[PDB]
Design a protein around this ligand. Structure first.
Ligand code: CLA
Ligand code: CLA
Ligand code: CLA
Ligand code: CLA
Ligand code: CLA
Ligand code: CLA
Ligand code: CLA
Ligand SMILES: CCCCCCCCCCCCCCCC(=O)OC[C@H](COP(=O)(O)OC[C@@H](O)CO)OC(=O)CCCCCCCCCCCCCCC
Ligand SMILES: CC1=C(C/C=C(\C)CCC[C@H](C)CCC[C@H](C)CCCC(C)C)C(=O)c2ccccc2C1=O
Lengths: 161, 74
């Protein structure tokens, strides 16, 4: 289930990316004017969502202007949540890539430092268990990715619509 | 005659690899048989990573401490 949650995140992220790019493409196309009736392709999605580079340029990098240029505007909160989501997502990487034993030994050294000063907590400091570490990493990964998409989508669709 | 730490007396662990090394524990019982290599059974307030706080130690791996010659604050 832990791995299936990552793959659900991937699946739903691609699904919402497809929907958002199609929605923006349709909004731009219906903004032809009235006279413009040959949309050819145009349809930025239909013309560019065929490459990974097409996505990376015309959807992510293109629409990120709204969320990264939101400082000093009411969408500055979306910008800050964008940054915080990236931070939480890299912290997830921290939890997912690492293992319990190392952190246990680090906590052993820190606890020696505590005992040296007569601090000695009795609820013995133990690092997160293997499953607990995986769960924390997955929670942070989902939070960071979903929050990044949340901030990006909301800033892009509120500033431009 | 009795050999080893007295029952219920605090001892300091001299086993370098023990989870309670140089810490303090209470002696539960000492096996009065010469063939037992680790007779001194010591109980600790702290549990190790295996969630067990009782272990047997050799006679030379425990230092019996007097009633007031150790540090009560660990
Ligand atoms: C000390 C370790 C450390 C730190 C601090 C950072 C810092 C950062 N990494 Mg990072 N990283 C590190 C080690 C570290 N790296 C290592 C070893 C690796 C492995 C190679 C990585 C791999 C990595 C990746 C892969 C990514 C990052 C990213 C980031 C950035 C996250 C965006 C940001 O600033 O959000 C913080 C900014 C804010 C504005 C948040 C503040 C406002 C929020 C809403 C509030 C949070 C405050 C908090 C709640 C305290 C308030 C308390 C109150 C509630 C009481 C940031 C520059 C991301 C990035 O920059 O993408 C381009 C990213 O994707 N890192
Ligand atoms: C930007 C920084 C940031 C953010 C946003 C989070 C966010 C989170 N961390 Mg976290 N963490 C961070 C940095 C951060 N962490 C750092 C630096 C470390 C150390 C490396 C950790 C270590 C860590 C561990 C070890 C664990 C978390 C967990 C969690 C989750 C807690 C779930 C919850 O609310 O339970 C409560 C659930 C509710 C439904 C309560 C309702 C929601 C509340 C009301 C939201 C508002 C919170 C609060 C009111 C904000 C104000 C607090 C105070 C100032 C009043 C949450 C997703 C835990 C969980 O991971 O995932 C399994 C967990 O075990 N974190
Ligand atoms: C096994 C579990 C399971 C099942 C049964 C479904 C079922 C469904 N999901 Mg779904 N989903 C699941 C798990 C599952 N999901 C999980 C875990 C996730 C998270 C990633 C999702 C995420 C998800 C999303 C995001 C969406 C769906 C959608 C759908 C619907 C797709 C309808 C469709 O495209 O028709 C196509 C299929 C047919 C028309 C059936 C016929 C196809 C061919 C012709 C059959 C060939 C038969 C052949 C003769 C015999 C073959 C035998 C051979 C195998 C030996 C359908 C109800 C979509 C939906 O409901 O949209 C409205 C949608 O948007 N799912
Ligand atoms: C593995 C995670 C973990 C967890 C869950 C705890 C939990 C606890 N520790 Mg602890 N500790 C740990 C690791 C951990 N520790 C490590 C690695 C060390 C270093 C070796 C210590 C060293 C330590 C000392 C020295 C002390 C504690 C204390 C405490 C208690 C007070 C909590 C606190 O500081 O509130 C902080 C405040 C909050 C959490 C409120 C903010 C809410 C946000 C949203 C969360 C609590 C039972 C204290 C204690 O016993 O209390 C009487 C104390 O004196 N711990
Ligand atoms: C708040 C910060 C802080 C804290 C709590 C500690 C805590 C500790 N340090 Mg320490 N240290 C620190 C910052 C800190 N360090 C920094 C910034 C330096 C660089 C100058 C050092 C350099 C340092 C040395 C060189 C030594 C310690 C030692 C110690 C331990 C004995 C305390 C002591 O000597 O009291 C001194 C009280 C007043 C001066 C204890 C675990 C000693 C140790 O662990 O020996 C076994 C030791 O030899 N520290
Ligand atoms: C240091 C570099 C760095 C790093 C590490 C990150 C890290 C992240 N960014 Mg990010 N970003 C950066 C720089 C960086 N950013 C810069 C400089 C910009 C421009 C301002 C952006 C703009 C940006 C946007 C606009 C978005 C992110 C998102 C994300 C998150 C993706 C998490 C994940 O697993 O996605 C999993 C990876 C994917 C789902 C792939 C999507 C990307 C490709 C191009 C889509 C291709 C679709 C196509 C149909 C092929 C599908 C294949 C399928 C099998 C996956 C993560 C927090 C996204 C997010 O929230 O999560 C997705 C998001 O919406 N970032
Ligand atoms: C990109 C993904 C995405 C997007 C765009 C949305 C969109 C929406 N969600 Mg949502 N949601 C998602 C994923 C997403 N969801 C997932 C994965 C979960 C599971 C955890 C939820 C759980 C959820 C709940 C439980 C609720 C919403 C709500 C909402 C609506 C208002 C947004 C909101 O209240 O955010 C909430 C944003 C914040 C609280 C910002 C917090 C930022 C930090 C903590 C502040 C830091 C201060 C220092 C909106 C329709 C709400 C709704 O129905 O409308 C009222 C609502 O109550 N969502
Ligand atoms: C949009 C955002 C989405 C986020 C992700 C949501 C889905 C996550 C799905 C995976 C995790 C599911 C976990 C269910 C439960 C589950 O399976 O547990 C997972 C894991 C289990 O560990 P163990 O197996 O070692 O637990 C002992 C048992 O096995 C036997 O007793 O426990 C934890 O992760 C511990 C913390 C859970 C509770 C966290 C409380 C946090 C309180 C505040 C923390 C400090 C402040 C932080 C700020
Ligand atoms: C860091 C790490 C630990 C150490 C984590 C510990 C010891 C959890 C304790 C962290 C404390 C509780 C953080 C408290 C919350 C932070 C202060 C941030 C939230 C509040 C701020 C936003 C203000 C593990 O135990 C572990 C286990 C398995 C795989 C990977 C890892 C892993 O990566």
């Amino acid at each position: 289930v832990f791995l299936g949650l990552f793959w659900m995140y991937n699946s739903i992220s691609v699904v919402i990316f497809h929907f958002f790019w199609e929605y923006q493409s349709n909004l731009a196309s219906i903004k032809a004017s009235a006279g413009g009736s040959i949309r050819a392709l145009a349809s930025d999605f239909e013309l560019n969502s065929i490459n990974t580079n097409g996505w990376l340029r015309n959807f992510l990098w293109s629409g990120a202007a709204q969320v990264i240029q939101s400082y000093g505007s009411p969408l500055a909160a979306y910008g800050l949540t964008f940054l915080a989501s990236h931070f939480v997502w890299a912290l997830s990487l921290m939890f997912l890539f690492s293992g319990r034993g190392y952190w246990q030994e680090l906590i052993e050294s820190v606890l020696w430092a505590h005992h040296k000063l007569y601090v000695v907590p009795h609820i013995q400091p133990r690092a997160l268990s293997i499953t607990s570490g995986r769960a924390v990493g997955l929670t942070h990964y989902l939070l960071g990715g979903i929050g990044t998409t949340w901030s990006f989508f909301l800033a892009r669709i509120v500033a431009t619509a | 005659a009795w050999v080893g730490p007295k029952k219920g007396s605090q001892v300091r662990i001299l086993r370098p690899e023990s989870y309670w090394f140089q810490q303090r524990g209470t002696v539960v019982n000492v096996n009065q048989k010469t063939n037992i290599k680790y007779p001194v059974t010591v109980k600790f307030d702290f549990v190790n990573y295996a969630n067990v706080n009782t272990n047997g130690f050799a006679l030379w791996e425990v230092d019996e401490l007097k009633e007031g010659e150790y540090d009560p604050d660990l």
